Structures are given as C-alpha cells and as structure tokens.
Ligand binder design. Sequence first.
Ligand SMILES: OC[C@H]1O[C@H](OC[C@H]2O[C@H](O)[C@H](O)[C@@H](O)[C@@H]2O)[C@H](O)[C@@H](O)[C@@H]1O
Ligand SMILES: [Ca+2]
Length: 586
Amino acid sequence: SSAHPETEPKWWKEATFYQIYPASFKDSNDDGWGDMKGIASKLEYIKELGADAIWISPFYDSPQDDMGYDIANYEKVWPTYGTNEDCFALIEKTHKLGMKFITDLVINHCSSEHEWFKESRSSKTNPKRDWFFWRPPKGYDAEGKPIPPNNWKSYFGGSAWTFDEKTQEFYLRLFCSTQPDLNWENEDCRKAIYESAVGYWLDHGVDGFRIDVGSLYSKVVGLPDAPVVDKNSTWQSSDPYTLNGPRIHEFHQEMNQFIRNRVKDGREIMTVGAMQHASDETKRLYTSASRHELSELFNFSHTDVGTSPLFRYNLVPFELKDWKIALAELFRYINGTDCWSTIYLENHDQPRSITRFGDDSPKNRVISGKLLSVLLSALTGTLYVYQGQELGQINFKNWPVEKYEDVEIRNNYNAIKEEHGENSEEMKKFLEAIALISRDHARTPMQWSREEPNAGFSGPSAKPWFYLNDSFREGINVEDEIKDPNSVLNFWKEALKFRKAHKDITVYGYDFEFIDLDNKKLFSFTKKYNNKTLFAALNFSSDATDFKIPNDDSSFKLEFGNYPKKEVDASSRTLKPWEGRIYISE
Ligand SMILES: OC[C@H]1O[C@H](OC[C@H]2O[C@H](O)[C@H](O)[C@@H](O)[C@@H]2O)[C@H](O)[C@@H](O)[C@@H]1O
Ligand SMILES: [Ca+2]
C-alpha cells in the first residue's frame, strides 16, 4: 500500500453518505412537502442504517422551477422547509449523532428571482450586468421572433437562451428559463458567489459540499455555435464549449483556496464535484490531492448506459460489460495516485437501480436489490446511498406523462411537440424512455409505512407535493422492512457493517482487475490490499452462472453474500439466480 497513496485514510473516503431529497423525505406539518424538522425526526434512522454522513439536496429559498436547483437566496432556507435556525439545529443534531453534513453547492447558475439577477436584468448599464451572459439577438426570423445568439440546447430541451423584453437581449440558461448561468469571467461575481454560497455555510459548520455541475463554470469565449451532431434537432449540445472549459481548473483551485482560508477551526472539508464526464487525465487534474481542487467526483457513464449519447430520452440496447466498464470508470484511474473516487447507483436525478440493473419483478426485486448492495459494498471510493435505495425501491409503473412533475419532462415534451409533433415517432421514443429513465422515479415521497394514502411521509389527510409510488402497498416501506429479517433494508445494514469491518480492502482496495469481463451475466473482479485479495462473483441474471477464482485455493473465505447464510456452499463454483458472493483471502 506504500505504492498506493490513495490508501491514505480520510474521514470522507470511508464515510457512507446518505442523500436526502428534502421535498420528499419527511413532512412534519402535513402540508405535503418534506421539511427540516421532518429530516431531524429521522436522523436516528439514517444513523441506524449505517450512514456516516448526509448530503441534503438544495433547501435554499427557491421558486422550485427546478425543485431547489434554482436558488433565489444562498443565505436563506426556503420558508416551506423551515428557518435558518431550523437548518442550524439540523446540522448540530447531525453532528451530535456523530455524522458529517454536506450541502449542495449550486453556483453555475442561480434563480432569475435572485437579487443579483433582478439587478442584472434591470438595464444594460447596472454594475451587475456582466454577472450573467447577455447577448443581443442574432437577428429576427421571418415571423418576427428574435433569433437566439447561438444554437445551444438546454439540458431540459429547446434553446439555452431566454429573451428579456425590457433590455432587448437574451440571457444564457443551460437549464430551465429561470436558471440564468452566472458569469465566472467576472471576478466580482466569483467573489460574491464564494461569500454567499460557500462562506456562509462554512461559517455555519458544514463539513463539505456536493458541487452541482461543477464542470460547467468555464465558457469558451464567444459562446460559439456548436457543431450539428444531431441532424434531427434544431438545438445542439453545448458540451465542447461549456464542459471542462479552459478556466475550469483555475476556478476550482481558486474556490478550494477560498475554502481553506475561510474555515475557522481547521476542520477537513470534503468537496464532491458532479462533473458529469471527463477523461481520466481531466479526472486526475480535478481530484489529485496535490492539485487542491476537488476531493472526488461523480462521473455519469454508469448511469448513462442504455441511453443514446445524442439524447437521454432515447433508449438503446446495452449489455452487462458496458455497465461494468462504465462503473470502473469511477475508480480505476485513482490506482497508484493521490486521487479519490465515488461509488453510487442512485441520486435525485436517476431512476431506481433495481429497475435499471437488477430485476424489479415481485419475484426478483428483493434478491436483485441485495445483489446491488453486495456489489456496492465491495467497491473502492466514497459510497453514496440515496433515500429509498436501502428499501429496494423500484420505478413507478404505468403513469401518464401529465402525472410527471419534472421540468426536464415538461420542457423536453414541449420541445419535441414543437419540433416533431405530439403525434410523432420522436414523441413515441421519448414516452418510452421516461418510463425507465425519468428523474421522477427518484422523487416520489419516501415510504415510511404501509399507511394509506401517504405511506407515513405525511399524515393521512395531507396532499403530498408529488404522487406516491404504489410500491409502499407491496411492503416497500420502512415499517414493513424493519420487522422482516429478510428485507432489503436489513440486508443493507449488514452490507454497511461488512464494508466497514473490511474497510482496508472494501473502501481502500486497489489493483482492481475484471475477471471474465465479456460475460453477459457474471460481474467478477479481484482487488488487493497488502497480503489480502478480495474476489467478487456476482450473477446479474435469473440463470445460474458458473465462476472461477483466479489462483483458487482454500485461503479464499466467503465473507459476504445475498443468499441465506446457512444454505450457501462456499466451495461451490456456480452462483444461483441473482446470487452474489464476496470472498477474501489473506
Ligand atoms: O442545477 C441544474 C441541474 O444540475 C444538476 O444535473 C445536471 C444534469 O445532470 C445529468 O445529466 C442529468 O441526467 C440531468 O437531468 C441533469 O440536468 C442537478 O443534479 C440536477 O438535479 C439539476 O436539475
Ligand atoms: Ca412540510
């Protein structure tokens, strides 16, 4: 491990994070929206699961056009969630339970309701005009409508620009129309961003930040038209000119130094960047400890599988090997470096992992949920568990499109309708994809009980902000799973116990090697830590599947798996349907 600087222990390397989506976690006052007192009331549940830290998605004052990722005030909690004091009490309670607290840092853009933007948009001459990207129309079209400055597509569909009638110019918004991008080329803007979004929260005791689209802050000068890579779309990906831009490392170094200089008590702050995609070299420039940029990053290749590189909401075939390789992209690059990785399958933007990568049928949802837990338990990096994942939550089924809340659904739907028609092949493909891929599969209220109609998320008379998944009725809920020794929840508790007990090779293991990479069913690998070898054999299939241990001997002991403990033959070399096993040799 001397040749593996990545094995140097840090609290944030070996912490298991639990991600909370505040709108959907726990409602304490029957208004149908989750809130801070609701979260506080369930911290003991999170601690008992085996979490070491929490990350709460944005709870700052926000119109909710993008459910909190459109921030009107970095220094004020959204009143529906609580007061600033409620948040501080929540951070303290988290801390007194022995857990760390990270907050979501959303500074690529703010709400158009933010005072900075209200000032910026007021005139062409005010001191905050250049805190955003304002450009005149390219010209006007034959119908008299202004033409946007370039052809860039919003992440949620349609143009990435919004016309302002008052000043007769467009402003850039890569996200929804009320999320204007902040201009990081303006130094006064950067400094104000740091004071408000970063310094305020450091002053109030956060242990770190999850950094939202951290790879988008640097725009290529001129904001040029993007190449036409999609010939069936008016608007084109801005990625070449917005993703990992020329100043992105300069910006992250400056922000890292701001944090180091603002912390008052010498505590160690973790930053995890939601960086989307980056070559391994770029990842190393971000996460190498000696670069003083990020602690670690999320890379989305593993959650991209089965979706068109041209459009998230067009499904394409994938095979197990594609997902194996994509998962390995999170962590192989850190081998023999001072970098660090993340490990996760779910978050507030993703559908449920059982539905995507296991088998969500009544027959197999439990065992395949446990398989995914076995897999995640064994991988190197900071592990993240998303609310409901520990219950084996699955996608909702058979929802009409109008039932979806997500702005990403609404905007993409309207873009397709405008470009192709509601009754088009393009629309049919979109509707097929949302049933599998929508962010809303992550966003239905947390299922605490089998109580009708709100599953313990709120009182029985409350109207939840968003519809409940019917799965609560089928026993996917905290109350039912605690009592069931065979539940996915109880399994996750054991998986986190196993991971911690063997953390040297589970969290800090290196020299990862695939075994039988091409196998369409078997996901198998080895890792090392000094004299120890970990071997995983994981059967992502309803078929039984053979495996081999490289250099097989009697030294490989079965240490963890998802089939009943007393019924597994460790010496056998065939996995039952959806069976996973971790062996360790020392
Ligand atoms: O703050 C806007 C937006 O940023 C983050 O996600 C960016 C993008 O990431 C992936 O590509 C997903 O598939 C997209 O749906 C996301 O828009 C936040 O995580 C996201 O919640 C937010 O809306
Ligand atoms: Ca509430």
